[PDB]
Amino acid sequence: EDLDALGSILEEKYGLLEAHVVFSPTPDYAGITHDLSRYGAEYMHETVKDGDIVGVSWGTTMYQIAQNMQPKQVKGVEVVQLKGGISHSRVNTYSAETIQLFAEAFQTMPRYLPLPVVFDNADVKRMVEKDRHIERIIEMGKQANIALFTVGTVRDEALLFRLGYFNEEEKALLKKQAVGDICSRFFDAKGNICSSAINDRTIGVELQDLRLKERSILVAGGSRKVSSIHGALTGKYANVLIIDQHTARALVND
Amino acid sequence: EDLDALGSILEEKYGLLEAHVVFSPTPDYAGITHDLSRYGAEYMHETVKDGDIVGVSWGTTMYQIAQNMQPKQVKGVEVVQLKGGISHSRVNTYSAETIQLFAEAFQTMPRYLPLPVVFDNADVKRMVEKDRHIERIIEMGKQANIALFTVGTVRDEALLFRLGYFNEEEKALLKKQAVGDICSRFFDAKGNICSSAINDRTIGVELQDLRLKERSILVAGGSRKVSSIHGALTGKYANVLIIDQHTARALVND
After folding, report:
1. What string of DSSP letters covers B188-233?
2. Is domain A1-254 annotated with CATH 3.30.450.20?
3. Could you tell me which residues come within 8 angstroms of residue A126 by beta carbon, excluding any fewer than 6 positions away?
4. Hey, are the CB atoms on A118 and B133 less than 8 Å from each other?
5. For chain A, which residues make up each domain, given as ranges?
6. Per the CB < 8 Å rule, is A115 touching B116?
7. A131 to chain B, minimum CA–CA distance in Å?
């Protein structure tokens, strides 16, 4: 693959500011993850500058990126959480450590979002987001000029299907209609929010706000995530894509 | 000091199930803290048994106890957070790590309380506590038969006075009337909640619920905490006290 050329195709196809088509020797998930994670860290290091407000998220890919981060002597940087929290899982989300590592690399301390990912009732979610203290955190998430995230998939094993937040109807709807999530907000193959009812009781950065950011950075790859990435990029939620060449070719071939 | 006799005085004076008066060679805060932390971990190890629900909290003493924890082959144990979260501080609270270390030592995974310590409005706090998912976490906190905490003080330094949660009037009230906090709930020298108005918009285990537990364990010491410990014990919020022999003598002397 001509990574430059292949990046150009993606930039044209989805209207990206930048598409970084990273060499990975093989197409298996772990290798792709290792290479994108390393590339991600360097990019963040190159890109982050005095005064930036950096919105981050949590998940296995994000954690690996965080671990790879190298210290950078920058000032006035804030690092804020964009994704809500869960109350229990058998696997550690490493959410705290992830934002800690990011914060430390940029000479600041985490701005946490101390809320659950979902409320049972949208009226409660709305009054929580209007809490004077919470609103400031959400506002910092909007002000963020860099946002860093991966996409999740809609497999049976997905975390968010396994936490009691959704009844039979809701899980079936998401499995049928959604291709993935950004920060726990589920979208379809055209980038549309699948269920406004569900999304209206979910906490985290609003997907439409991502489109406004100077750099909205999606790091993702693996055949498992092709539909998800396509949906996210069709919805135009990222302007910078970090992706390996196997996945990048899979996206073009349709 | 005769530790056993001095423990007996404390058990009678405050009506404690157990008073563990721990030897520390000096009245130095750090030294007291190191010895109490170690004794704490040992006690927790001895005490925790198959099927216990353990309520923990976060802070520097708690973090230290968690670090000293040794693995225990126990089963069916749940470990749950009793103390709400903050959104930022310049010092890491180690809240995540603290509850992780406790959970791992007891062969389980943390049950987080993904909420802020304070809401601006009590009607919002109440609606959040009644959220179906949140209510289960609070219920687990109530069901907990072991609770582990220290007391905080009311000095100008105190975290909770520096986070925007309280206006001038409220900070002055707590400074004048409170002697300390347990899990961010402020009480006076007689153990009474200082401000029901503030307390009604604060998240975390309710102090009155601590009195019902099989073991409500207070680890605390240092001349800085004499008034705080006295208030907490006068309110009878702990039935097990882990304290060094300097502080313990200071309590008897009034």
Report:
1. -TTS-BS-HHHHTTB-B--HHHHTTSSEEEEE--SGGGHHHHHHHH
2. no
3. A200
4. yes
5. 1-254
6. yes
7. 6
